[PDB]
Amino acid sequence: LRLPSPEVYRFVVKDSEENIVFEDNLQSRSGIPIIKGGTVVKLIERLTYHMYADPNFVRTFLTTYRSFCKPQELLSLLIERFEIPEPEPTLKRFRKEYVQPVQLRILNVFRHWVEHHFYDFERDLYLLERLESFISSVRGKAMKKWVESIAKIIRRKKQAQANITFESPPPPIEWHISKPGHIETFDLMTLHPIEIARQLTLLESDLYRKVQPSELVGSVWTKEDKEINSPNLLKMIRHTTNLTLWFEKCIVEAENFEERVAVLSRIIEILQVFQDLNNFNGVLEIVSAVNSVSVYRLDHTFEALQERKRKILDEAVELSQDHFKKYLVKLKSINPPCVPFFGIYLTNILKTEEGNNDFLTRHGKDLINFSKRRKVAEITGEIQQYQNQPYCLRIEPDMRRFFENLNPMGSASEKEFTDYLFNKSLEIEPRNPKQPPRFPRKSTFSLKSPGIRPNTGR
Ligand SMILES: NCc1ccc(S(N)(=O)=O)cc1
């Protein structure tokens, strides 16, 4: 009874379809009403509601909010929420049934915020200055525990900001023609295919484990705030592009037909080791390379593959068909560790982003579509389940450095570079029915694969 005037406290404007929308269905009957959308004011209100706790909304909100609210603005709204004015009189119930419950719900939000999304503060020291200054100003007797708990989390995050443990013997590193410390001799064909697969899998596992759901929500990696909203996603996308184009480049620049067949075969071996390692990211990067317009059209090179190499490629390619029907089946059947195919989460998020309005309307004046953010958090959520299981393989630092530095494009555009691959493809297997032209090798190394049975393994 008796809140302050909406005129001095924007959160207590009356609930109407002007400001807030709930799901009206059989699920929303029992218990905590389910939010479909509202003004950001109204969503903040319900994020810190006096009448009940809402752990599920707090989790979804803090995962998704960056698609509709800046971190600086969220802090401003939680402080605005916190600074609750006195009701209009002619306080004791107001203070214990409204204020204290609301202020604890705010401090609970801050606690989830610094616990699970401290990257927001790592990305913006000013954001953290504002949070530290505000939290240190809270002198409420019952607030004390919460304030201490938030301080302890910030201390732990700052520590680990400044400050690999094998649970079983990892396999011995495999060497082919390229020997350790000879990084200048590192090529697709001089490195061991087993170790190429292992070190790309370690690189790709590391890139994949660093991606936060929030880097995907509201397709933020394509918007202009992407380098800050999606740094880990964009490293992973740039990796995929560089490795996919490196495989294409290795195939199409092998002018000598025998060499090119040996190169395509070696790639397919690498694909088999990716499959053994449940690195489906790796599998579908190679699939991506071999269905590329510049490599797809090399009918003579494909034809000359051993039927067994052909078979492994066909099975891999089929994982991708019918909207990755078989990949999705395979992914649910394997034992981690694994690197999921990252592309399909991007695709399925673009479809969900594109297909749902960011807003319910402009008649209520920016009613945020929250249910849209819930559906995307279900997709980003699936990412999480394979991020907590590391590979029992050893880093080969110079191989790691080679693969981290892959730059097939050089200074050219993606476009300039894919035009080049295509002009090269037409040169090496022209659009005529004559046998493929016969070019000399420029490389001297044996074409012979050591295969994908471990050698030093034993
Ligand atoms: N050059 C014919 C050709 C290219 C590539 C494939 S695939 N999709 O990689 O199995 C199949 C045939």
Swiss-Prot record:
| Disulfide-bonded cysteines | none
What are the residue boundaries of the N-terminal Ras-GEF domain, all occurrences included? 31-158
What's the protein called, per UniProt?
Son of sevenless homolog 2
Instruction: From the UniProt record, report the name of the gene that encodes this protein.
Output: SOS2
- Lineage, please? Eukaryota, Metazoa, Chordata, Craniata, Vertebrata
Task: Tell me the function of this protein.
Answer: Promotes the exchange of Ras-bound GDP by GTP.
The associated disease is: Noonan syndrome 9: A form of Noonan syndrome, a disease characterized by short stature, facial dysmorphic features such as hypertelorism, a downward eyeslant and low-set posteriorly rotated ears, and a high incidence of congenital heart defects and hypertrophic cardiomyopathy. Other features can include a short neck with webbing or redundancy of skin, deafness, motor delay, variable intellectual deficits, multiple skeletal defects, cryptorchidism, and bleeding diathesis.
Q: Which domain of life is it from?
A: Eukaryota
Ras-GEF domain residues are 192-431
Quick one: where's region Disordered? 432-458
Organism this protein belongs to: Homo sapiens
